[PDB]
CSV table of C-alpha atoms in Angstrom, one decimal:
chain,number,residue,atom,x,y,z
A,1,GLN,CA,80.9,-1.8,-37.0
A,2,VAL,CA,79.9,-2.4,-33.7
A,3,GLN,CA,81.3,-0.5,-30.8
A,4,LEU,CA,80.5,-1.6,-26.8
A,5,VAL,CA,81.1,1.1,-23.9
A,6,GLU,CA,82.0,-0.1,-20.3
A,7,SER,CA,80.8,1.8,-17.3
A,8,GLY,CA,80.5,-0.2,-13.9
A,9,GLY,CA,83.8,-1.1,-12.6
A,10,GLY,CA,86.3,0.8,-9.3
A,11,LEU,CA,87.2,-0.2,-6.0
A,12,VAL,CA,85.3,-2.1,-3.4
A,13,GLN,CA,85.7,-3.9,0.1
A,14,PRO,CA,86.7,-7.5,-0.2
A,15,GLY,CA,82.5,-9.6,-0.2
A,16,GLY,CA,81.3,-6.2,-1.0
A,17,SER,CA,79.8,-5.8,-4.3
A,18,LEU,CA,79.4,-4.6,-8.0
A,19,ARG,CA,77.7,-4.2,-11.1
A,20,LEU,CA,79.1,-3.8,-14.9
A,21,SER,CA,77.2,-3.0,-17.5
A,22,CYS,CA,78.5,-3.1,-21.5
A,23,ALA,CA,76.5,-0.9,-24.4
A,24,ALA,CA,76.6,-1.9,-28.0
A,25,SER,CA,76.2,0.4,-30.5
A,26,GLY,CA,76.5,-0.3,-34.4
A,27,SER,CA,74.3,-3.0,-35.9
A,28,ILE,CA,73.3,-4.9,-33.5
A,29,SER,CA,70.7,-7.2,-35.5
A,30,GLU,CA,73.7,-9.6,-36.0
A,31,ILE,CA,75.6,-10.1,-32.6
A,32,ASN,CA,73.9,-13.6,-30.6
A,33,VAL,CA,76.7,-13.7,-28.4
A,34,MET,CA,78.1,-10.8,-26.0
A,35,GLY,CA,80.4,-11.7,-22.5
A,36,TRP,CA,82.9,-11.2,-20.0
A,37,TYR,CA,86.1,-11.6,-19.4
A,38,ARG,CA,88.9,-10.7,-17.3
A,39,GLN,CA,93.0,-9.8,-17.5
A,40,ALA,CA,94.5,-10.5,-14.2
A,41,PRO,CA,98.0,-7.9,-14.3
A,42,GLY,CA,100.4,-10.6,-15.3
A,43,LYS,CA,98.3,-13.7,-17.0
A,44,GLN,CA,95.8,-13.5,-19.6
A,45,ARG,CA,92.3,-13.5,-20.1
A,46,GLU,CA,90.0,-15.8,-18.5
A,47,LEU,CA,85.8,-15.9,-19.2
A,48,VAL,CA,83.9,-14.6,-16.0
A,49,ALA,CA,80.2,-15.3,-18.0
A,50,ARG,CA,78.2,-15.4,-21.0
A,51,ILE,CA,75.2,-14.7,-22.6
A,52,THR,CA,73.4,-15.6,-25.9
A,53,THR,CA,70.1,-13.5,-27.4
A,54,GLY,CA,68.2,-16.5,-25.5
A,55,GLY,CA,69.2,-16.3,-22.4
A,56,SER,CA,71.5,-19.5,-22.0
A,57,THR,CA,74.0,-18.1,-19.8
A,58,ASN,CA,77.7,-20.1,-19.8
A,59,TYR,CA,80.2,-19.1,-16.4
A,60,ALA,CA,83.0,-20.6,-14.7
A,61,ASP,CA,83.9,-22.3,-11.6
A,62,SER,CA,86.0,-19.7,-9.7
A,63,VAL,CA,83.1,-17.3,-10.5
A,64,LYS,CA,80.3,-19.7,-10.4
A,65,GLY,CA,77.3,-19.2,-8.0
A,66,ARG,CA,78.4,-15.5,-7.7
A,67,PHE,CA,78.7,-13.7,-10.6
A,68,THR,CA,75.2,-13.1,-12.5
A,69,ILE,CA,75.5,-12.3,-16.5
A,70,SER,CA,71.8,-10.3,-17.8
A,71,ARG,CA,70.7,-9.2,-20.5
A,72,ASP,CA,68.5,-5.9,-21.2
A,73,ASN,CA,67.1,-5.5,-25.1
A,74,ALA,CA,65.6,-2.6,-24.3
A,75,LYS,CA,68.8,-1.0,-24.5
A,76,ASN,CA,70.7,-4.1,-26.0
A,77,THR,CA,73.0,-4.0,-22.6
A,78,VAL,CA,74.6,-7.0,-20.5
A,79,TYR,CA,75.5,-6.4,-16.9
A,80,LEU,CA,77.4,-8.3,-15.0
A,81,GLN,CA,76.1,-8.2,-11.3
A,82,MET,CA,79.8,-9.4,-9.0
A,83,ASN,CA,78.5,-10.3,-5.3
A,84,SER,CA,81.1,-11.5,-2.3
A,85,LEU,CA,84.0,-10.4,-4.3
A,86,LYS,CA,87.0,-11.5,-3.1
A,87,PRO,CA,90.4,-10.2,-3.6
A,88,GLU,CA,91.6,-12.6,-5.9
A,89,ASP,CA,88.8,-10.8,-8.2
A,90,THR,CA,90.7,-7.8,-8.8
A,91,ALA,CA,91.3,-7.5,-12.6
A,92,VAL,CA,90.2,-5.7,-15.6
A,93,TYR,CA,86.9,-7.0,-17.4
A,94,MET,CA,86.8,-7.1,-20.9
A,95,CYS,CA,83.1,-7.3,-23.1
A,96,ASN,CA,82.0,-9.2,-26.0
A,97,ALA,CA,79.9,-8.5,-28.9
A,98,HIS,CA,79.7,-11.8,-31.2
A,99,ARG,CA,78.9,-11.2,-35.2
A,100,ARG,CA,77.4,-14.2,-37.0
A,101,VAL,CA,76.7,-13.9,-41.0
A,102,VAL,CA,75.1,-16.7,-43.1
A,103,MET,CA,75.2,-16.8,-46.9
A,104,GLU,CA,75.7,-19.2,-49.9
A,105,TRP,CA,79.3,-21.6,-48.5
A,106,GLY,CA,78.7,-20.8,-44.8
A,107,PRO,CA,79.0,-19.1,-41.7
A,108,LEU,CA,81.7,-15.8,-40.8
A,109,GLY,CA,82.6,-14.1,-37.1
A,110,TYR,CA,83.5,-10.7,-36.1
A,111,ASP,CA,84.5,-10.4,-32.0
A,112,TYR,CA,84.0,-7.1,-30.6
A,113,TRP,CA,86.1,-5.9,-27.5
A,114,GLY,CA,85.6,-3.3,-25.1
A,115,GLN,CA,87.4,-1.0,-23.6
A,116,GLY,CA,87.6,-2.7,-20.2
A,117,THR,CA,87.0,-1.3,-17.0
A,118,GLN,CA,89.9,-1.7,-14.4
A,119,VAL,CA,88.4,-3.4,-10.9
A,120,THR,CA,89.9,-3.2,-7.9
A,121,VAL,CA,89.3,-5.2,-4.6
A,122,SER,CA,90.8,-4.6,-1.2
B,15,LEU,CA,65.5,-42.3,-61.8
B,16,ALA,CA,68.7,-41.1,-60.8
B,17,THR,CA,69.0,-39.7,-64.6
B,18,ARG,CA,65.1,-38.5,-64.6
B,19,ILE,CA,65.5,-36.4,-62.2
B,20,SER,CA,69.7,-35.7,-62.5
B,21,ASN,CA,68.8,-33.6,-65.7
B,22,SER,CA,65.5,-32.2,-64.7
B,23,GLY,CA,65.2,-28.2,-64.1
B,24,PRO,CA,62.5,-27.6,-61.7
B,25,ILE,CA,64.4,-30.3,-59.1
B,26,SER,CA,67.4,-29.0,-59.2
B,27,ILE,CA,65.9,-26.2,-58.1
B,28,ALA,CA,64.2,-27.5,-55.2
B,29,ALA,CA,66.8,-28.7,-54.2
B,30,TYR,CA,69.0,-26.0,-54.2
B,31,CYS,CA,67.0,-23.7,-52.0
B,32,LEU,CA,65.4,-26.9,-49.7
B,33,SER,CA,69.3,-27.3,-48.9
B,34,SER,CA,70.0,-23.3,-48.5
B,35,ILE,CA,67.2,-23.4,-45.9
B,36,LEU,CA,68.4,-26.7,-44.8
B,37,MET,CA,72.4,-24.7,-44.0
B,38,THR,CA,70.6,-21.4,-42.8
B,39,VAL,CA,68.8,-22.6,-40.4
B,40,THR,CA,71.6,-24.9,-38.7
B,41,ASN,CA,74.0,-21.9,-38.4
B,42,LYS,CA,71.2,-19.3,-37.3
B,43,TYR,CA,69.3,-21.2,-35.2
B,44,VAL,CA,70.2,-24.3,-33.9
B,45,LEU,CA,73.9,-23.6,-33.1
B,46,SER,CA,73.1,-19.7,-32.7
B,47,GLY,CA,75.5,-20.1,-28.7
B,48,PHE,CA,78.6,-21.0,-31.4
B,49,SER,CA,81.4,-18.2,-31.8
B,50,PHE,CA,83.9,-18.8,-34.1
B,51,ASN,CA,86.2,-16.0,-35.8
B,52,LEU,CA,88.3,-18.4,-37.4
B,53,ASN,CA,86.4,-17.8,-40.8
B,54,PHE,CA,89.2,-19.7,-43.2
B,55,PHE,CA,89.8,-22.7,-40.7
B,56,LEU,CA,85.9,-23.2,-40.1
B,57,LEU,CA,85.3,-23.4,-43.8
B,58,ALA,CA,88.5,-25.6,-44.6
B,59,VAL,CA,86.9,-28.1,-41.9
B,60,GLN,CA,83.0,-27.3,-44.1
B,61,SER,CA,85.0,-28.9,-47.2
B,62,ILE,CA,86.7,-31.6,-45.3
B,63,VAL,CA,83.4,-32.9,-43.4
B,64,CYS,CA,82.3,-32.9,-47.6
B,65,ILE,CA,84.8,-34.8,-48.8
B,66,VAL,CA,84.7,-37.3,-46.4
B,67,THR,CA,81.1,-37.4,-46.9
B,68,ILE,CA,81.0,-38.1,-50.0
B,69,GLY,CA,84.9,-40.3,-50.3
B,70,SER,CA,82.9,-42.6,-47.8
B,71,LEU,CA,79.7,-43.0,-49.9
B,72,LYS,CA,81.7,-44.0,-52.6
B,73,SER,CA,84.3,-46.3,-50.8
B,74,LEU,CA,80.8,-47.9,-49.5
B,75,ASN,CA,79.6,-48.0,-53.3
B,76,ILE,CA,76.8,-46.5,-53.1
B,77,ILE,CA,77.1,-43.2,-55.1
B,78,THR,CA,80.2,-43.0,-57.4
B,79,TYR,CA,82.5,-40.3,-59.8
B,80,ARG,CA,85.8,-40.1,-61.2
B,81,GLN,CA,88.9,-41.0,-59.4
B,82,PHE,CA,91.0,-38.0,-59.1
B,83,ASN,CA,93.4,-36.7,-61.6
B,84,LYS,CA,96.2,-34.6,-61.5
B,85,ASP,CA,95.9,-33.5,-65.2
B,86,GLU,CA,92.0,-32.3,-64.8
B,87,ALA,CA,92.6,-31.0,-61.1
B,88,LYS,CA,95.5,-28.3,-63.1
B,89,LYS,CA,92.5,-26.8,-65.1
B,90,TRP,CA,90.3,-26.8,-62.4
B,91,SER,CA,92.3,-24.7,-59.8
B,92,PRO,CA,91.0,-21.2,-61.5
B,93,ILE,CA,87.2,-22.2,-59.7
B,94,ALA,CA,89.4,-23.6,-57.3
B,95,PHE,CA,91.1,-20.3,-56.6
B,96,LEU,CA,87.8,-18.1,-57.4
B,97,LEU,CA,85.3,-19.8,-54.7
B,98,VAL,CA,88.0,-19.4,-52.2
B,99,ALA,CA,88.1,-15.5,-54.1
B,100,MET,CA,84.6,-14.7,-53.3
B,101,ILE,CA,85.1,-15.9,-49.7
B,102,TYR,CA,88.1,-13.7,-49.0
B,103,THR,CA,86.3,-10.9,-50.4
B,104,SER,CA,82.9,-11.2,-48.7
B,105,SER,CA,84.5,-11.5,-45.1
B,106,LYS,CA,86.1,-8.8,-46.0
B,107,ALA,CA,83.3,-6.3,-47.7
B,108,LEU,CA,80.9,-7.2,-44.1
B,109,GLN,CA,83.7,-6.0,-42.1
B,110,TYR,CA,82.7,-2.8,-42.9
B,111,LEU,CA,79.4,-3.4,-44.6
B,112,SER,CA,76.0,-4.9,-42.8
B,113,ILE,CA,74.0,-7.9,-44.5
B,114,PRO,CA,71.5,-5.1,-46.0
B,115,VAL,CA,74.1,-3.4,-48.0
B,116,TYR,CA,75.8,-6.3,-49.1
B,117,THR,CA,72.4,-8.0,-50.5
B,118,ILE,CA,72.1,-4.5,-52.4
B,119,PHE,CA,75.4,-5.5,-54.3
B,120,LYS,CA,75.0,-9.4,-54.4
B,121,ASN,CA,71.5,-8.4,-56.5
B,122,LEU,CA,73.1,-5.8,-58.7
B,123,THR,CA,75.6,-8.9,-59.8
B,124,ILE,CA,72.9,-10.7,-61.5
B,125,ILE,CA,72.5,-7.4,-64.1
B,126,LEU,CA,76.8,-8.3,-64.6
B,127,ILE,CA,76.4,-12.4,-64.2
B,128,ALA,CA,73.3,-12.1,-67.3
B,129,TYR,CA,75.7,-9.9,-69.2
B,130,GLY,CA,78.1,-12.3,-69.2
B,131,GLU,CA,76.1,-15.2,-70.3
B,132,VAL,CA,74.8,-13.5,-73.2
B,133,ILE,CA,78.8,-12.4,-74.3
B,134,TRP,CA,80.0,-15.5,-73.1
B,135,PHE,CA,78.0,-18.1,-73.8
B,136,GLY,CA,75.4,-16.6,-76.1
B,137,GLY,CA,72.1,-15.6,-76.5
B,138,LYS,CA,70.8,-12.4,-75.8
B,139,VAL,CA,68.5,-10.7,-72.1
B,140,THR,CA,65.1,-9.7,-72.7
B,141,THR,CA,62.6,-6.8,-71.4
B,142,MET,CA,60.8,-9.2,-69.4
B,143,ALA,CA,63.7,-10.5,-67.6
B,144,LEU,CA,65.7,-7.5,-66.8
B,145,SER,CA,63.0,-6.5,-65.3
B,146,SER,CA,62.6,-8.8,-62.7
B,147,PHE,CA,66.4,-7.8,-62.2
B,148,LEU,CA,65.4,-4.8,-61.3
B,149,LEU,CA,62.8,-6.0,-59.1
B,150,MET,CA,65.1,-8.1,-56.7
B,151,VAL,CA,66.9,-5.1,-56.5
B,152,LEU,CA,63.7,-2.7,-55.5
B,153,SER,CA,63.5,-5.0,-52.7
B,154,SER,CA,66.7,-5.2,-51.9
B,155,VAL,CA,66.3,-1.4,-51.7
B,156,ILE,CA,63.4,-1.3,-49.8
B,157,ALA,CA,65.2,-4.1,-47.0
B,158,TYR,CA,67.8,-1.5,-46.2
B,159,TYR,CA,65.9,1.0,-45.7
B,160,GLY,CA,63.8,-0.6,-43.1
B,170,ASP,CA,85.4,6.5,-41.0
B,171,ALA,CA,85.6,7.9,-44.6
B,172,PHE,CA,88.3,5.2,-45.0
B,173,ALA,CA,86.4,2.2,-43.8
B,174,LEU,CA,83.8,2.9,-45.6
B,175,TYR,CA,85.3,2.8,-48.5
B,176,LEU,CA,87.2,0.3,-48.1
B,177,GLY,CA,84.1,-1.0,-47.5
B,178,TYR,CA,82.8,-0.9,-51.6
B,179,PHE,CA,85.9,-1.6,-52.5
B,180,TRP,CA,85.6,-4.8,-51.3
B,181,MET,CA,82.6,-5.1,-52.6
B,182,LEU,CA,83.1,-4.9,-56.1
B,183,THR,CA,85.7,-7.2,-56.2
B,184,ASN,CA,83.4,-9.7,-54.5
B,185,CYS,CA,81.0,-8.7,-57.8
B,186,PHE,CA,83.7,-9.6,-59.6
B,187,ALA,CA,85.0,-12.9,-58.2
B,188,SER,CA,81.4,-14.3,-57.5
B,189,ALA,CA,80.5,-13.3,-61.7
B,190,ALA,CA,83.8,-14.9,-62.7
B,191,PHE,CA,83.3,-17.6,-60.6
B,192,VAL,CA,79.9,-19.3,-61.8
B,193,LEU,CA,80.6,-18.3,-65.4
B,194,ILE,CA,83.8,-20.0,-65.7
B,195,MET,CA,82.7,-23.1,-63.5
B,196,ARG,CA,79.5,-23.6,-65.6
B,197,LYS,CA,81.5,-23.5,-68.8
B,198,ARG,CA,84.0,-26.2,-67.1
B,199,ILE,CA,81.4,-28.2,-66.7
B,200,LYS,CA,80.8,-28.5,-70.4
B,201,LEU,CA,84.6,-29.5,-71.8
B,202,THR,CA,84.5,-32.0,-68.9
B,203,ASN,CA,81.1,-33.2,-69.1
B,204,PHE,CA,81.4,-33.6,-65.6
B,205,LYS,CA,79.1,-34.9,-63.0
B,206,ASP,CA,77.5,-33.3,-60.2
B,207,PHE,CA,80.0,-35.3,-58.0
B,208,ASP,CA,83.2,-34.7,-59.6
B,209,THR,CA,82.4,-30.8,-59.3
B,210,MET,CA,81.4,-31.5,-56.0
B,211,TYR,CA,84.8,-33.2,-55.0
B,212,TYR,CA,87.1,-30.9,-56.7
B,213,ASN,CA,85.8,-28.0,-55.4
B,214,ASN,CA,86.3,-29.6,-52.4
B,215,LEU,CA,89.7,-30.8,-52.4
B,216,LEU,CA,91.3,-27.8,-53.9
B,217,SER,CA,90.0,-25.2,-51.8
B,218,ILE,CA,91.1,-27.3,-48.9
B,219,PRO,CA,94.8,-26.3,-49.0
B,220,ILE,CA,93.8,-22.4,-50.4
B,221,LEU,CA,91.7,-21.9,-47.2
B,222,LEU,CA,94.2,-23.4,-44.8
B,223,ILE,CA,96.8,-21.2,-45.8
B,224,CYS,CA,94.8,-18.3,-46.1
B,225,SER,CA,93.9,-19.3,-42.4
B,226,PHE,CA,97.8,-19.1,-41.6
B,227,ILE,CA,98.4,-15.9,-42.9
B,228,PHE,CA,95.4,-13.8,-42.2
B,229,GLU,CA,93.7,-14.9,-39.5
B,230,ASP,CA,94.9,-14.7,-35.7
B,231,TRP,CA,96.2,-18.3,-34.1
B,232,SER,CA,97.6,-16.3,-31.3
B,233,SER,CA,97.7,-17.5,-27.8
B,234,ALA,CA,93.9,-15.9,-26.7
B,235,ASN,CA,92.3,-16.3,-29.6
B,236,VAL,CA,93.2,-19.8,-29.9
B,237,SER,CA,91.5,-20.3,-26.6
B,238,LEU,CA,88.6,-17.7,-26.8
B,239,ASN,CA,87.6,-20.1,-30.0
B,240,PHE,CA,88.3,-23.4,-28.4
B,241,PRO,CA,87.6,-23.5,-24.9
B,242,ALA,CA,89.3,-25.9,-22.8
B,243,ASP,CA,86.3,-26.4,-21.1
B,244,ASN,CA,84.0,-27.2,-23.5
B,245,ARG,CA,85.7,-29.0,-26.7
B,246,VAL,CA,82.6,-31.6,-27.9
B,247,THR,CA,81.1,-28.5,-27.9
B,248,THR,CA,82.7,-26.5,-29.9
B,249,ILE,CA,84.1,-30.0,-32.0
B,250,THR,CA,80.6,-31.2,-32.3
B,251,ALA,CA,79.1,-27.4,-33.5
B,252,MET,CA,81.9,-27.4,-35.5
B,253,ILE,CA,80.8,-30.6,-38.1
B,254,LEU,CA,77.2,-29.7,-37.7
B,255,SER,CA,77.9,-26.5,-39.0
B,256,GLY,CA,79.9,-28.3,-42.0
B,257,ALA,CA,77.7,-31.8,-42.7
B,258,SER,CA,75.0,-28.8,-43.2
B,259,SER,CA,77.0,-27.6,-46.2
B,260,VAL,CA,76.9,-30.9,-47.5
B,261,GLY,CA,73.5,-29.9,-49.6
B,262,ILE,CA,73.8,-27.0,-50.7
B,263,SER,CA,77.6,-28.3,-52.1
B,264,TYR,CA,75.7,-30.5,-54.1
B,265,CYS,CA,73.0,-28.8,-55.6
B,266,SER,CA,74.3,-25.5,-56.4
B,267,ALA,CA,76.7,-27.1,-58.7
B,268,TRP,CA,73.9,-29.4,-59.8
B,269,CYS,CA,71.3,-26.3,-60.2
B,270,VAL,CA,74.8,-24.4,-62.3
B,271,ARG,CA,74.8,-27.9,-64.2
B,272,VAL,CA,71.2,-28.1,-65.8
B,273,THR,CA,69.6,-24.5,-65.7
B,274,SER,CA,72.2,-21.5,-65.9
B,275,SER,CA,74.2,-19.4,-64.5
B,276,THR,CA,71.8,-16.6,-63.7
B,277,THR,CA,68.9,-19.4,-63.3
B,278,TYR,CA,71.1,-20.0,-60.5
B,279,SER,CA,72.5,-16.5,-59.3
B,280,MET,CA,68.6,-15.3,-59.1
B,281,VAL,CA,67.6,-19.0,-57.3
B,282,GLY,CA,70.0,-17.4,-54.6
B,283,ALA,CA,68.7,-14.3,-54.6
B,284,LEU,CA,65.4,-15.8,-53.7
B,285,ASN,CA,66.9,-17.8,-51.5
B,286,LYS,CA,66.7,-15.1,-48.8
B,287,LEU,CA,63.1,-14.2,-49.1
B,288,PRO,CA,61.9,-17.9,-47.1
B,289,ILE,CA,64.2,-16.3,-44.5
B,290,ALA,CA,63.2,-12.9,-44.6
B,291,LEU,CA,59.1,-14.4,-43.6
B,292,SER,CA,60.0,-16.7,-41.0
B,293,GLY,CA,61.3,-13.8,-39.0
B,294,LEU,CA,58.2,-12.2,-39.2
B,295,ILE,CA,55.7,-15.3,-38.7
B,296,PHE,CA,58.2,-17.1,-36.4
B,297,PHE,CA,60.3,-14.9,-34.3
B,298,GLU,CA,59.8,-10.8,-33.3
B,299,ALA,CA,60.9,-8.9,-36.2
B,300,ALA,CA,58.5,-5.9,-37.6
B,301,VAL,CA,55.4,-6.5,-39.8
B,302,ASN,CA,56.1,-2.6,-40.8
B,303,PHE,CA,55.6,-1.7,-44.3
B,304,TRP,CA,59.6,-1.5,-45.1
B,305,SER,CA,60.0,-5.1,-44.4
B,306,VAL,CA,56.2,-6.5,-45.9
B,307,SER,CA,56.4,-4.9,-49.6
B,308,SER,CA,59.9,-6.1,-49.3
B,309,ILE,CA,59.0,-10.1,-49.3
B,310,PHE,CA,56.1,-9.1,-51.7
B,311,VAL,CA,58.1,-7.2,-54.2
B,312,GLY,CA,60.9,-10.1,-54.2
B,313,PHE,CA,58.1,-12.5,-54.8
B,314,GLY,CA,57.1,-10.5,-57.6
B,315,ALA,CA,60.7,-10.8,-59.1
B,316,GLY,CA,59.9,-14.9,-59.3
B,317,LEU,CA,57.4,-14.9,-60.5
B,318,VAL,CA,58.2,-12.4,-63.5
B,319,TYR,CA,61.9,-14.3,-63.9
B,320,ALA,CA,59.4,-17.2,-64.1
B,321,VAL,CA,57.0,-16.6,-66.9
B,322,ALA,CA,59.9,-13.9,-68.7
B,323,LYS,CA,61.9,-17.7,-69.6
B,324,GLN,CA,58.4,-18.7,-70.7
B,325,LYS,CA,58.6,-16.5,-73.1
B,326,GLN,CA,61.8,-16.6,-73.8
B,327,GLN,CA,61.0,-20.9,-74.2
B,328,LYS,CA,58.8,-19.9,-76.2
B,329,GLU,CA,60.8,-17.7,-78.8
């Protein structure tokens, strides 16, 4: 129903920089939260950042003060500016989008996941 | 005064719209950053909140309702099964269909409840009342206009919701009359029996993997998730009482028409308090919906005098 395409990943030298993007598609009116996750090889998903329609940003301590998630309502995109990338930042970064709909007995939530962009820092 | 208000038709209607407005506001404007894709477990938590809410009021000697009965829970089971049936089929309907298309089909069920109340409860559907049903479908059509297998499953899970939603109100309203249930007995049984079904449905039909659990219940934010899981269920106390209240006094048709009119204040709020477009296909949707309510109201006046 909602489709997300990610672009921006790649190989960057330690201490460098990277900007990731995630364009949403489909029904984009019920989406309330959109964030980024990373899966280190051999480990499970972790939270990198989270934004909502209203600009309330949630980060992770390991990346607090470095990564900056922002939104662009013109094209329904979320960016993730990753400065000062240490080698421990290499992972596969995925996008999220929460669809929330409210009816006569309660809300319903549907999570949509992007494709994943591999980011390698070396 | 608790008796005159209890058997009041207009008041049950007004209290139902207020409780629907309050519940939609909490889940859309107060809890905007909330993310929870374990639908049946959160709805089971809502029924737990309403159970402890009225169970504590009765234990404080404020309100009073009937004791739990084994022979009366076995007779309320079809209604509780149907209540979760609408929940399951609508969640599966909205995974392939949108909200605007969901409302088109949900306003097409009032024509089916109106003609089910006639067959089972006796009566007639007037022409003035019928034209108001088609004016709510028109407002839905106007508002909406402003994989092949996937869209086949979209309407399959939507026609099954139409049958489960129509059967729920018709069967429930019948059962508040051979039991002489009040609005707290109906609320008590609708929630007590729905807890085990919603929990069992959440076990088999939902993802309880290590990664989806830690995505729904983050360890770095537990007070926020628990708080939002209780504010989301405390706003449904009013709509749980006022749904059974409205059905008992007025009708299953009137309760369904009021539910369709409960989405017009939300639409008008978006056009004033938010950025929602003011194009012709969104202003004439509200105006046409208002005409549907004002034609249904006069239709029942003529029917009352006929």
